[PDB]
Ligand binder design. Structure first.
Ligand SMILES: Nc1ncnc2c1ncn2[C@@H]1O[C@H](COP(=O)(O)OP(=O)(O)NP(=O)(O)O)[C@@H](O)[C@H]1O
Ligand SMILES: Nc1ncnc2c1ncn2[C@@H]1O[C@H](COP(=O)(O)OP(=O)(O)NP(=O)(O)O)[C@@H](O)[C@H]1O
Lengths: 254, 253, 87, 253, 254
């Protein structure tokens, strides 16, 4: 009856312990430099194949911020405020979260599904007998592609969001280019409004990809488990991004 | 190679799969394992192959305890065996060339020119000379499986394991695989293990057979001896007969 | 006659291969029939080596092998039943 | 009743699976279809008068064209069929009791008392009395098939189709399924169709066999007659010989 | 070479036409033929099971908005804005978007997998062979349970977000409470802005669930198809929500 929940919680938490151990091995020892020349290939499916989604969302978010900012800011200071609010919002809160979640979706479920199949088909297992450690051959380049790709995407998301904001806020709705640009320069500091967006992005890139690899590399070889793993990678990295985003922003701007 | 398996015991979590299995994998012979579905046949091969940790069991390769082997001894030992898995285990991201060539890079440092020639020879030995440079995902069923086998024999291993080779449904394929096993067995002086289902096809191939169920050996012998000493479990199992020690729920009021 | 002989294994494959090529480079006179009796058995890469040699000169030039171990033939006869089985 | 399919033609995925198939399903007899895998076996059964639409040809039940003729008759007519699709389907969200009960609600309006009794009788007919409250997902594979069959015969249908029941299994199960077919064809005056790759079993069960490949019937007869007409295709197919009109890919150079 | 893309575009658009046709066939209110106990049950999986995720997300978003608003407002010297901005941000832009993306999102993915599994397994084929039209048993209660559930979850998300906002903005950071509640009333209203938040969620609920059903159901039985479909639902659900969010907000508050 009740003990059921008890057992569920106990096992899920044991699994986090396992994930921590896996992460340690993959990051801790990677001497096979000759085979890491392929991670550039792996990046194709994490980074290159995801620009379309990040770019389109960045444009819609920029345009939305432009319109909502404007309808509020006409009562307070659009001439000075569209610039400052569009750029701070995108650099501090949205590029690191919206790109992080779209990424967790598009790259995250695809990646976990792929590791999942590698395990389910027994293909991965056959490598143990050939002496090729699957963590160094299969997992390593996938985790690294995730680390590099999300941060570069995060920057693009914001770059597009700025275009979106200006396109409506300045060009269709009647605001000065001068004060838009100077306002942004007056209030946006590289140190640390641009820099903190990047730091949060690295944290999310590691946490989110780490989960996707871990769940794909599941214990139970049952077909039902692939769909379960895919749903869970989206849910867990999604909450983790929001949880960590809160703490990091609390420090960075508090 | 002679492989000793003694007092094997293995649990998967809390469930016991094996309980003191004793096997003699005879040199140069074809041995086979038969039994009911789901009783750990694949688990047993994985334990023999050293990929799982046995619980207090002893596994010896040419008399050497695998648990005591150094990293170099183990690594070198890997080149002594190859296996064909139930799904075929092909790598979808690589063309056939790499799928067969692949294990060569785990043990050797060869020029690309010699690597290519070995791939060509191994594909010819199984009738796949013409599939060169095609992606494996584009192969028909019979061809798909033959490629996987070519990988297993790529390094001239002493031992080949076949996990469910006769579970293929196509009578044409059953014909071809039977012939390849016999052909390769002789050409390369191989010791082989066939672990399968559908008895009309392992009883005519193996030299020696074990019948395994519920973690225990239920009898051993040549095909003739198993019939001679066919304890009722074995007898009905090999016959495919009804009214064996098989239960279903039943009571009425 | 100049032939390559001894144990061919993965560890010296590159060198045995090049030695044979050196012989081919100097093979201004042929047919030469290569005596493989002094060849350690059970290694298919030896065949890969023999074939690459065939691929440079013998396939057009008319070079052949003799006293070939029975095992090498069993490997060949897995499928190459069209081989030039003649001395 | 008799079922006739004439001049059947069907194109799926821009490829023709069937080309002028002409079948006569004999009443009260066991009709079986054999052939290479991946050639339409499931498809041909679906085109018997299920949910697929042929491009050419006709489907006749009792000699009547089922296409167009009429909505109400066809709804009721559907109550005369039961099937096991591939692995066999059970609904995961329903108990065994409900899986067997389910089709009853498609055509009848009965009291809870009578629907419950029919389920009890049908489960006993396949040796499943007393398993009603377990969820189907907790059953062993042998039982999953038997539950699905109980559903198939739940409405006292005239035609039972077994789609590849012998393809891959345990020899004990093969013994049981064979017996259930023998028991039921008589007990319920059934016409049955067995479509299967495992030629040795089909050959001793069916009264009449069609061999179908590459979209055409390539020979027909009782098993005794098929053995008498050794068209290279049929002969290789029914014997398992690796020699015949099959291919390997090689050319030396 | 180039035609490859052309074939891809053509097939995806053809598929849309099919999806539109399916929606028309399912939407007629025909399900009344059977019981609706099935609906109540189905709601368990699409709605009730997701309350934990949406609640935790709402709390973190609320707290983040609180801290970011505050660190900007202290440079205006006008703290009454926490009430006005926490409320407008959540009611107009974030509850309708964050909830929609976490929803499908999780429910989206799980639903796709479940229907698709029923296709792959032959369960659906059997039902037609029996004579029970699967759209009235398998699809109907799933599409509607999704419609009711997301809008309801949107409200809870905002409600948690506002409370989280106050919890830091007023109670830890020293803002006089009276200005918070007054700021909310001045000038965002229950009869206008709350209403527009709900309307957007009805639209999103239909886009998300409609896509999830389609992706699971409408596909020839390719074994790799389930994992691909799951990823695809997340991507299309997400872009459709953002594209529509822009056009609707542009009208509601334009
Ligand atoms: N880490 C794990 N945790 C739980 N189950 C696992 C794990 N790894 C593999 N499996 C088990 O692997 C076992 C393999 O043996 P088995 O179930 O008999 O399949 P099989 O040999 O291919 N069956 P068959 O084809 O009839 O011989 C299954 O019973 C699974 O439970
Ligand atoms: N609805 C569909 N639309 C398009 N392609 C499909 C569909 N379903 C399956 N496929 C293909 O159409 C055929 C499905 O039926 P079929 O050939 O009868 O399977 P089968 O012979 O029973 N398979 P198998 O049991 O492995 O031998 C195969 O050629 C599939 O590649």
């Amino acid at each position: 009856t009740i003990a059921w929940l008890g057992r569920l919680v106990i096992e899920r938490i044991r699994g986090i312990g396992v994930a921590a151990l896996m992460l340690l091995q993959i990051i801790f020892s990677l001497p096979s430099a000759g085979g890491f020349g392929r991670f550039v290939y792996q990046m194709h499916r994490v980074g290159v194949m995801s620009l379309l989604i990040i770019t389109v969302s960045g444009l819609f978010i920029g345009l939305v911020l432009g319109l909502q900012g404007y309808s509020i800011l006409v009562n307070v200071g659009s001439e000075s405020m569209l610039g400052t609010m569009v750029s701070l919002t995108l650099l501090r809160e949205l590029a690191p979260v919206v790109a992080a979640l779209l990424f967790a979706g598009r790259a995250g479920s695809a990646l976990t599904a792929e590791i999942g199949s590698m395990k389910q088909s027994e293909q991965l297992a056959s490598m143990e007998m050939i002496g090729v450690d699957p963590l160094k051959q299969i997992v390593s380049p996938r985790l690294w592609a995730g680390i590099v790709s999300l941060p570069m995407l995060t920057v693009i998301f914001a770059a597009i969001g700025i275009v979106g904001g200006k396109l409506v806020g300045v060009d269709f709705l009647g605001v000065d280019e001068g004060s838009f640009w100077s306002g942004m320069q007056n209030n946006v500091q590289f140190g640390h409004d641009v820099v903190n967006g990047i730091i949060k992005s690295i944290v999310f890139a590691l946490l989110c990809t780490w989960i996707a690899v871990f769940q794909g590399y599941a214990c139970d070889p049952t077909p039902e488990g692939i769909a379960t793993a895919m749903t869970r990678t989206v849910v867990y990295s999604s909450l983790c991004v929001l949880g960590f985003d809160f703490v990091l922003t609390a420090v960075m701007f508090g | 190679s002679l492989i000793e398996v003694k007092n094997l015991s293995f649990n998967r979590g809390e469930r016991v799969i094996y309980d003191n299995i004793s096997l003699n994998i005879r040199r140069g012979q074809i041995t086979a394992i038969m039994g009911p579905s789901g009783t750990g046949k694949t688990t047993l091969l994985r334990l023999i192959g050293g990929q799982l940790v046995p619980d207090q069991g002893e596994v010896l390769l040419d008399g050497k305890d695998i648990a005591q082997m150094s990293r170099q001894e183990l690594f070198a030992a890997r080149a002594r065996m190859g296996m064909l898995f139930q799904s075929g285990a092909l790598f979808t991201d690589m063309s056939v060339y790499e799928n067969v060539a692949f294990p060569i890079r785990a043990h050797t440092k060869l020029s690309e020119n010699l690597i290519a020639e070995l791939v060509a020879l191994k594909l010819e030995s199984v009738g796949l000379r013409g599939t060169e440079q095609l992606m494996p995902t584009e192969l028909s069923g019979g061809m798909n499986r033959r490629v996987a086998l070519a990988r297993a024999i790529a390094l001239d291993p002493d031992l080949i394991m076949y996990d469910e080779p006769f579970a293929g449904q196509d009578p044409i394929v059953k014909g071809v695989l039977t012939r390849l096993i016999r052909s390769l067995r002789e050409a390369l002086d191989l010791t082989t293990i066939i672990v399968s289902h559908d008895v009309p096809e392992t009883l005519s191939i193996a030299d020696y057979i074990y019948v395994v169920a519920e973690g225990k050996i239920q009898g051993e012998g040549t095909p003739e001896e198993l019939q001679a000493y066919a304890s009722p479990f074995v007898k009905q199992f090999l016959t495919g007969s009804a009214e064996g020690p098989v239960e279903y729920q039943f009571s009425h009021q | 006659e100049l032939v390559v002989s001894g144990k061919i294994d993965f560890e010296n494959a590159e060198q045995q291969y090049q030695a044979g090529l050196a012989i081919i480079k100097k093979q201004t006179s042929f047919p030469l029939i290569v005596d493989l009796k002094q060849l350690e058995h059970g290694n298919t890469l030896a065949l890969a080596v023999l074939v690459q040699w065939l691929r440079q000169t013998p396939q057009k030039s008319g070079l052949h092998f003799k006293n070939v171990p029975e095992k090498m033939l069993k490997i060949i006869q897995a499928c190459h039943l069209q081989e030039d089985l003649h001395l």
